[model samples]
Target: MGKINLNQIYTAKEMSERIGKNRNYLSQAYRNNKHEILKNFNYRKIGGTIIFSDNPNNDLSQLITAKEASQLLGKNDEYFAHIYKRFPHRLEGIDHIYTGKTLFLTKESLEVFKKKM
Candidate 1:
């Protein structure tokens, strides 16, 4: 079971699983320009497809969940959430961002948080 195509037409459902974000998150991202939901005109809404021509390298950056972030620091899943609740100004947009119910964290910011701790 192997294949290659001249072009790949990826659906939002497929992309959500691939990038580990909620489908609605992608919708918001497409509107906010936070990631590669609409970098070029490759993203179409005819039916539901995000086209990939010669390359499909254009994608979202490394964004992890709060659970994953807590894991990195050997804490419980609620650790980052607690910290965020206490210090929203320090980590709201820089360290992490939320789109509806989804939370995405950057490792670079995690490293900084680690250093401070």
Candidate 2:
């Protein structure tokens, strides 16, 4: 597909429809790949509502998650769990939504992990 420059902001639901993925999945991807994803996108949280952009230059760190990291790495959930448990320091505040399987990684951490792999 040809590259499409995004000049307008979008909601999480709008992004899900545009990308043909579930809202939760897209949210996970955002949370998991905050660094890389935010590099091109930007977002805002107003009264608990999230608004995002397609521009990779926007910062979307607040929405990243561990499942999103797994998707980026093409690994299973167990792998991320192991990483989280063994290197808790790396995770730090990145861990959220723990009740029903959730985790997050910063762009910095993802880069660090990539180097080791």
Candidate 3:
């Protein structure tokens, strides 16, 4: 498991939505240092990029382990890890998203896996 930094710079629409401002104002604020609010501590605009929040790393503490899925079934971490190794097909009912480098297993996705077990 790694600490996911949620404070990473976001795209135009993403940064604007987080600050409760529209994309138009975001671009306008950085046009030529017009708005003082844009230069405040909470926000900073950089070469066509921007940070949404103040914190260095709004952290996400999630693990890349079956502690998520097995937790849904009231099982131990190694319990499902072993199952995944020997009998991968048995746990096919567990939804796996292929977004990141490997299968992305989110707590929310695994939470709903209890019914399938």
Give the candidate number with the greatest TM-score: 1
Q: Per-residue CA lDDT of candidate 1, range 1-117, in tens? A: 112221233445545555676766556666687755456334443213332222344232334566688888899987878777787766633456543244546556677777766
TM-score of each: 0.46, 0.36, 0.34
User: Where's the lowest-lDDT run of ten residues in candidate 2?
Assistant: 1-10
Name the weakest run of 10 consecutive residues (lDDT summed) in model 1: 1-10
Q: What's the lDDT for candidate 2?
A: 0.55
Q: List clash counts for every candidate, in order.
A: 0, 17, 0
Please give me the total number of clashing residue pairs in predicted model 1: 0
Cα lDDT tens digits, model 3, 28-83, are 66666666756553444322344344443433223234544566567775666676
lDDT of 3 at 91: 62
Assess candidate 1 and give its TM-score to the true structure. 0.46
When sorted by lDDT, best at the front, the candidate numbers are: 2, 1, 3
Q: Which stretches of candidate 1 lie over 4 Å from their true place?
A: 1-61, 90-94
Candidates' C-alpha lDDT: 0.53, 0.55, 0.49
C-alpha lDDT of candidate 3 relative to the true structure = 0.49
How far off is residue 51 in model 3, in Å? 19
Please give the lDDT score at residue 33 for candidate 2: 73
